[PDB]
């Protein structure tokens, strides 16, 4: 055994030792309990960043910990290969997105292997290979025949300069974020997943997830947005029926979740596309300009509530069905066409959104709810205004004295007898649009025939192979310009027909990759029935915060879809969720000659804070998440080249808990490396003074007071580490517990015979307790202390007797 810790000399050897033993290559062995530990598979952007290393080290700790406890652990790895970054790099470097992707995959796979992750590489998948996406095309055709996937027209943002479709997040003040040209609203036929049919099932099944974070389940409930309310019809006044046709000339229909406050309605609001808005705007240019501004808006629902609410009066009036009040109709910008009736009622006294709207335009506020002896202030909103639980009705005539649910049914009874309303359940959830006007994505298995319509590609002719010999030019997506691709024959009649040129949303690949890992080479279905039965569902999921709501919802949707097709048996894909915190770092900038700032990477600077090149001082700015925005990203390959994989893994797990943000620190990295030097020195000095012995075990009566205390600290540390790994999922404190154990070991005389046995017992446990964190040095140190296989010795057991005083 060498005297000095040198990770470059032991880490390649430890990996080949695990590779030859094939401890990470697992099968459906019924003689062992299974454990599926899944980390979110990376996008092949070119090289790993710090978020990758932290995510997959967290997953490797939980995987190696469960492996030492006898579990048959599957920890797979793949590549979320589709996306736009390959197209943009293709337009910059003039290469093909496929070749650019496959090279990034090979390089990043070498980096992941160098980190020593216990990964079953025989289950590796790449979503851009036809061997993978052929099965999401298959499920598309099956759900298309059933109607779960359908085709309808939708509105998109067209950039006429870049000749591409943009999302609302890429539109700023009505212009494209790159071209700066005014976007155009176009209606094109697209494909949709009828996810609203599974809304009740997606909402109720959240109760089965006993181990999910309550805030994550709450975000799923809000996005689905189930509400039990009331449909209410306000009769249009005789002096406001001009220009209206059909039912819109008779009544204005609205939906409300607070029918107990129907007596407190002071005005109604309609969307810009509502027929009442169209009729009143026929002779009013202000209303026409307001309607045009609402239609030209490009607000994302993540910023919908942050939008300033605006409205215009119409001069048209409707009649409240309960008290007969005449209420003026307003055109509001927050009322969305397609959401319910496209019209709402307004109660400013018990809805803060209506309170701010009425206070702006000085609209009346009528109180109809009372909570105790609390005073009602018409010029200041209070939280109890919207209380549905402890409220009682006032200023409501016959409805006075009733609570929420009694007034709900009583209002329902009054409206149904008049034929002016009935209860209704609504959902904020929209259907899932999957059509993307991009090249680098999974093709849509639809052929357009003028005599047969939109016919699905039969299962024999799948996949619809995306051509890889394509270099995007920018002026339009390539698929719509390649007749050699879209010109084909109709699979129903054999006549001339055109393939679908749009590609699928990349969320589709991530909605079922956890099932493909179970049988990645299965060619008769999405997943074999044998492997799905054994592995069941993912026991532990580790990923980031980005797009968590949509990804989880889509993955839970695909699970129930595949279950209904008879492919899987579970109702939920993920039993446990661990979302890691971001990695932040300090930023550095030097002021410009044009009134700006140029941001410098931390690798090109040294703290005296001075630039590393010209030696001119550079401003050290604030800390934020590593990104190419302010050039603050630290390459983990430089961290591995300098200290090794074990130091990188240890610093990640020790600097902060997994959920908390990790702040980059050069001193913290050195401290992790010095501890690995200390651990190597401890084992080396122990073996230099006599070599290994048999670890102490059994009855400890007769040991000295000093040696009994060390065994107490030892088996107390083992209990604390097991709780940190298996329950708390707090790996930083577990490293601190082992450090305290080594501290007391240093202060203890282990020179006696039984003292050497206690020392052997202490060291054999410490290297096994840190094996999930730093497996390379622990495997190397374990072979010096004991001749058995580390994974066969298992997780260290707690000696209960070593705790009785
Ligand atoms: Mg349960
Ligand atoms: Zn045909």
Dihedral sign, Cα of residue 452, residue 458, residue 461, residue 464:
positive
The C-alpha atoms of residue 2 and residue 455 are separated, in whole angstroms, by: 69
The C-alpha atoms of residue 82 and residue 145 are separated, in whole angstroms, by: 26
Cα 695 to Cα 27, 149, 692, 710, 787: the distances in Å are 34, 64, 9, 14, 12
Name every residue whose Cβ is closer than 8 Å to that of residue 141 and which is 6 or more positions away in sequence.
445, 456, 457, 458, 459, 462
Cα 337 to Cα 197, 270, 294, 397: the distances in Å are 20, 9, 11, 34
The residues that bridge with 396 in the sheet, in sequence order, are none
Cα–Cα nearest to 60, from 774, 635, 581, 719: 774
- The answer to whether 362 and 390 are in contact (CB under 8 A) is no
Quote the distance between the C-alpha of residue 638 and its chain's center: 28
How many angstroms separate the alpha carbon of residue 494 from the centre of ligand 2?
6
Positions at the binding site: 628
φ and ψ at residue 501, rounded to 5 degrees? -95, -15
How many angstroms separate the alpha carbon of residue 440 from the centre of ligand 2?
28
The C-alpha atoms of residue 189 and residue 567 are separated, in whole angstroms, by: 31
The residues that bridge with 378 in the sheet, in sequence order, are none
How many angstroms separate the alpha carbon of residue 515 from the centre of ligand 1?
20
- The answer to whether 335 and 271 are in contact (CB under 8 A) is yes
How many angstroms separate the alpha carbon of residue 572 from the centre of ligand 1?
11
List, in sequence order, every beta strand (DSSP E) within 347-452.
Answer: 369-370, 392-393, 421-427, 432-433, 435-436, 446-449
Cis peptide bond N-terminal to 463, omega within 30 = yes
The ligand whose atoms approach the alpha carbon of 212 most closely is: 1
Cα 427 to Cα 351, 460, 555, 664, 771: the distances in Å are 19, 38, 19, 43, 49
- Token code pair at residue 760: 């052997």
Resolution of the structure, angstroms: 2.5
The C-alpha atoms of residue 472 and residue 139 are separated, in whole angstroms, by: 29
Query: Angle at which helices 705-723 and 753-769 pack, to 10 degrees?
Result: 10
DSSP letter at 695 equals P
- Beta strands 583-591 and 432-433: pairing type? unpaired
The ligand whose atoms approach the alpha carbon of 497 most closely is: 2
How many angstroms separate the alpha carbon of residue 548 from the centre of ligand 2?
41
Positions at the binding site for ATP: 628
The ligand whose atoms approach the alpha carbon of 498 most closely is: 2
The ligand whose atoms approach the alpha carbon of 496 most closely is: 2
How many angstroms separate the alpha carbon of residue 631 from the centre of ligand 2?
54
How many angstroms separate the alpha carbon of residue 455 from the centre of ligand 2?
8
How many angstroms separate the alpha carbon of residue 498 from the centre of ligand 2?
10
The ligand whose atoms approach the alpha carbon of 537 most closely is: 1
- Token code pair at residue 517: 């890992």
């Amino acid at each position: 055994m060498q005297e000095h810790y040198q990770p470059a000399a032991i880490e390649p050897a430890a990996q080949k030792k695990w590779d030859d033993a094939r401890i990470s290559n697992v099968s459906e062995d019924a003689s062992k309990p299974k454990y599926y530990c899944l980390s979110m598979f990376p996008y092949p952007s070119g090289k790993l960043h710090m978020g990758h290393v932290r995510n997959y080290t967290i997953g490797d700790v939980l995987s190696r910990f469960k492996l030492l406890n006898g579990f048959n652990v599957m920890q797979p790895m793949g590549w979320d290969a589709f996306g736009m970054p390959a197209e943009n790099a293709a337009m910059k470097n003039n290469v093909a997105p496929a070749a650019w992707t496959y090279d990034n995959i090979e390089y990043m796979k070498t980096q992941l292997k160098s980190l020593g992750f216990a990964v079953d590489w025989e289950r590796e998948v790449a979503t851009c290979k036809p061997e993978y996406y052929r099965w999401e095309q298959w499920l598309f055709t099956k759900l298309f025949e059933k109607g779960i996937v359908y085709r309808k027209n939708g509105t998109v943002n067209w950039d006429p300069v870049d000749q591409t479709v943009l999302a609302n997040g890429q539109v700023i003040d009505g212009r494209g974020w790159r071209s700066g040209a005014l976007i155009e609203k176009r209606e094109i036929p697209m494909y949709y997943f009828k996810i609203t049919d599974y809304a009740e099932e997606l909402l109720n099944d959240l109760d089965k997830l006993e181990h999910w974070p309550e805030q994550v389940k709450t975000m799923q409930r809000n996005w689905i947005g189930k509400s039990r309310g009331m449909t209410v019809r306000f009769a249009v006044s005789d002096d406001s029926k001009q220009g209206l046709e059909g039912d819109y000339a008779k009544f204005l229909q609205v939906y409300t979740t607070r029918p107990d406050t129907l007596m407190g309605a002071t005005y109604v609001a309609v969307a810009a596309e509502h027929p009442l808005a169209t009729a009143a705007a026929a002779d009013k240019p202000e209303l026409q300009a307001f309607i045009a501004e609402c239609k030209a808006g490009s607000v994302a629902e993540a910023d919908m509530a942050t939008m300033e609410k605006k409205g215009v009066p119409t001069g048209r009036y409707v009649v409240n069905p309960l008290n007969g009040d005449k209420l003026e109709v307003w055109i509001a910008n927050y009322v969305l066409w397609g959401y319910g009736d496209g019209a709402v009622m307004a109660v400013p006294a018990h809805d803060e959104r209506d309170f701010e709207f009425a206070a702006k335009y000085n609209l009346p506020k009528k109180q109809v709810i009372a909570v105790g002896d609390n005073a009602f202030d018409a010029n200041r909103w209070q939280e109890w205004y919207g209380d549905k639980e402890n409220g009682v009705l006032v200023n409501s005539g016959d409805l006075d004295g009733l609570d929420f649910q009694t007034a709900f049914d009583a209002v329902a009874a009054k409206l149904q007898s008049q034929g002016a309303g009935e209860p209704k359940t609504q959902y904020r959830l929209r259907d899932w649009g999957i059509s993307r006007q991009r090249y680098w994505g999974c093709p849509i298995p639809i052929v357009h025939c003028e005599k047969c319509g939109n016919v699905p590609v039969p299962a024999d002719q799948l996949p619809v192979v995306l051509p890889e010999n394509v270099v995007p030019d920018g002026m339009g997506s390539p698929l719509a310009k390649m007749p050699e691709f879209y010109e084909t024959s109709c699979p129903c009649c054999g006549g001339a027909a055109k393939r679908e040129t749009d590609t699928m949303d990349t969320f589709i690949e991530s909605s079922w990759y956890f099932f493909r890992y179970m049988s990645p080479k299965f060619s008769d279905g999405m997943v074999s029935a044998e492997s799905a039965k054994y592995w069941g569902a993912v026991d532990q999921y580790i990923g980031g915060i980005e797009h968590a709501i949509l990804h989880l919802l889509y993955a839970r949707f695909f699970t129930k879809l595949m279950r209904d097709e008879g492919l899987v048996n579970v109702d939920e894909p993920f039993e446990r969720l661990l979302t890691q915190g971001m990695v932040v770092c300090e930023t550095y900038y030097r002021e410009n000659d044009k009134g700006g700032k140029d941001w410098i990477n931390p690798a090109d600077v040294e703290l005296t804070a001075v630039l590393k090149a010209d030696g001119l001082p550079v401003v050290i700015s604030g800390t934020e998440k590593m990104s190419k925005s302010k050039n603050n990203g630290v390459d983990p390959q430089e961290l591995i080249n300098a200290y090794g994989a074990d130091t990188a893994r240890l610093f990640m797990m020790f600097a902060a808990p997994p959920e908390q943000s990790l702040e980059w620190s050069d001193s913290g990295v050195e401290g992790a490396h010095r501890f690995l030097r200390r651990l190597w020195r401890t084992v080396y000095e122990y073996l230099k003074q006599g070599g290994a012995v048999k670890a102490f075990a059994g009855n400890q009566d007769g040991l000295s007071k000093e040696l009994k205390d060390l065994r107490h600290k030892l088996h107390s540390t083992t209990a604390k580490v097991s709780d940190d790994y298996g329950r708390r999922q707090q790996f930083n404190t577990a490293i601190a517990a082992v450090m305290e154990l080594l501290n007391q070991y240093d202060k203890t005389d282990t020179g006696s015979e039984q003292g050497r046995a206690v020392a052997q017992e202490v060291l054999e446990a410490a290297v096994r307790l840190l094996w999930p964190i730093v497996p390379h040095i622990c495997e190397t140190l374990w072979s010096e202390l004991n001749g058995a296989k580390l994974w066969e010795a298992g997780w260290p057991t707690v000696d209960e007797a070593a705790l009785v005083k």
